[PDB]
């Protein structure tokens, strides 16, 4: 007589979020880069901030279909978003270095992987480093890509207003979801002792990616409060994180979230 509201088939067949996280991660994206120009500061980071442009695009795709996600307050989805774009970039560019090159180079895009030469050329070389020694840790560990794509989640959870977001219980609870989700996702078949061990590598990475993206950030609103006399060019993407993130990380109201 009446119409069951609930699908057993529908339950059944609706993938695990760590399996959505694989089907909405982004495609990769190519920078741009023109050889035929000089390797001049001015020039490798402009190309650099065209290709977190196009990447943030993406990332903000990718954000929308995130699991849990739609549950925050928009204004907290924004507010999240804008304050860990560096940490998803960086970790990001971490990844393709270690798949693409195993770590040997930083992989920003198909068409601009840098060498050391690069790397001092872009006058950011200690930056770099900082972002290769992250790329040297996934080899160490063995980084999995279920355990990236939860991680990555993680980071775009792992910065907050001082003041606080419009909804601190729906944040904790989708941050808590995604810890569960990289607790389990460590758990070998069965040994707690390695279990805890390797959990306790991931999250001293992910916190280690604080003080690597307050380092990412100084230069970079640096170079953008100078950027006519350095001539770094910045895309309309950029500019608009940029000016809201600035004047907010150098107040003093970001506040970094750590699990040590
Ligand atoms: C121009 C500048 O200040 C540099 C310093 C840190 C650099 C960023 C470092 C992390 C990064 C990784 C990428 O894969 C895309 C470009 C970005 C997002 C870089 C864009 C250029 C930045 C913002």
């Given at each position: 007589?009446?119409?069951?509201?609930?699908?057993?088939?529908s339950?059944?067949?609706?993938?695990?979020?760590?399996?959505?996280?694989?089907?909405?991660?982004p495609?990769?994206?190519?920078?741009?880069?023109?050889?035929?120009?000089?390797?001049?500061?001015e020039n490798?980071?402009?190309?650099?901030?065209?290709?977190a442009?196009?990447?943030?695009?993406?990332?903000?795709?990718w954000?929308?279909?995130?699991?849990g996600?739609?549950?925050?307050?928009?204004?907290?989805?924004?507010?999240?978003?804008?304050?860990?774009?560096m940490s998803?970039?960086?970790f990001?560019?971490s990844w393709?270095?270690?798949?693409?090159?195993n770590?040997?180079?930083?992989?920003?895009?198909?068409?601009?992987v840098?060498?050391?030469?690069?790397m001092?050329?872009?006058?950011?070389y200690?930056?770099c480093?900082?972002?290769?020694?992250?790329?040297?840790?996934?080899?160490?560990?063995?980084?999995?890509?279920?355990?990236?794509?939860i991680?990555?989640?993680?980071?775009?959870?792992?910065?907050?207003?001082?003041?606080?977001?419009?909804?601190?219980?729906?944040?904790?609870?989708?941050?808590?979801?995604?810890?569960?989700?990289?607790?389990?996702?460590?758990?070998?078949?069965?040994n707690?002792?390695?279990?805890?061990?390797?959990?306790?590598?991931?999250?001293?990475?992910?916190?280690?990616?604080?003080?690597?993206?307050?380092?990412l950030?100084?230069?970079?609103?640096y170079?953008?409060?100078?950027?006519?006399?350095?001539?770094?060019?910045?895309?309309?993407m950029?500019?608009?994180?940029?000016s809201?993130?600035?004047?907010?990380?150098?107040?003093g109201?970001?506040?970094?979230?750590?699990?040590?």
């Amino acid at each position: 007589a009446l119409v069951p509201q609930l699908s057993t088939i529908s339950r059944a067949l609706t993938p695990s979020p760590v399996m959505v996280l694989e089907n909405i991660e982004p495609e990769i994206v190519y920078a741009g880069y023109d050889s035929s120009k000089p390797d001049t500061a001015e020039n490798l980071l402009s190309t650099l901030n065209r290709l977190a442009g196009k990447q943030m695009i993406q990332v903000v795709k990718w954000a929308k279909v995130l699991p849990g996600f739609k549950n925050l307050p928009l204004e907290d989805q924004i507010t999240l978003i804008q304050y860990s774009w560096m940490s998803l970039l960086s970790f990001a560019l971490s990844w393709r270095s270690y798949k693409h090159t195993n770590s040997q180079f930083l992989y920003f895009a198909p068409d601009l992987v840098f060498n050391e030469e690069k790397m001092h050329q872009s006058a950011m070389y200690e930056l770099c480093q900082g972002m290769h020694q992250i790329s040297l840790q996934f080899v160490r560990l063995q980084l999995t890509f279920e355990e990236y794509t939860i991680m990555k989640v993680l980071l775009l959870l792992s910065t907050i207003p001082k003041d606080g977001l419009k909804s601190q219980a729906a944040f904790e609870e989708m941050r808590t979801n995604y810890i569960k989700e990289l607790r389990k996702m460590v758990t070998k078949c069965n040994n707690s002792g390695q279990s805890w061990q390797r959990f306790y590598q991931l999250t001293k990475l992910l916190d280690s990616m604080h003080d690597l993206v307050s380092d990412l950030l100084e230069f970079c609103f640096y170079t953008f409060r100078e950027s006519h006399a350095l001539k770094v060019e910045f895309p309309a993407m950029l500019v608009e994180i940029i000016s809201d993130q600035l004047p907010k990380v150098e107040s003093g109201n970001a506040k970094p979230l750590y699990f040590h």
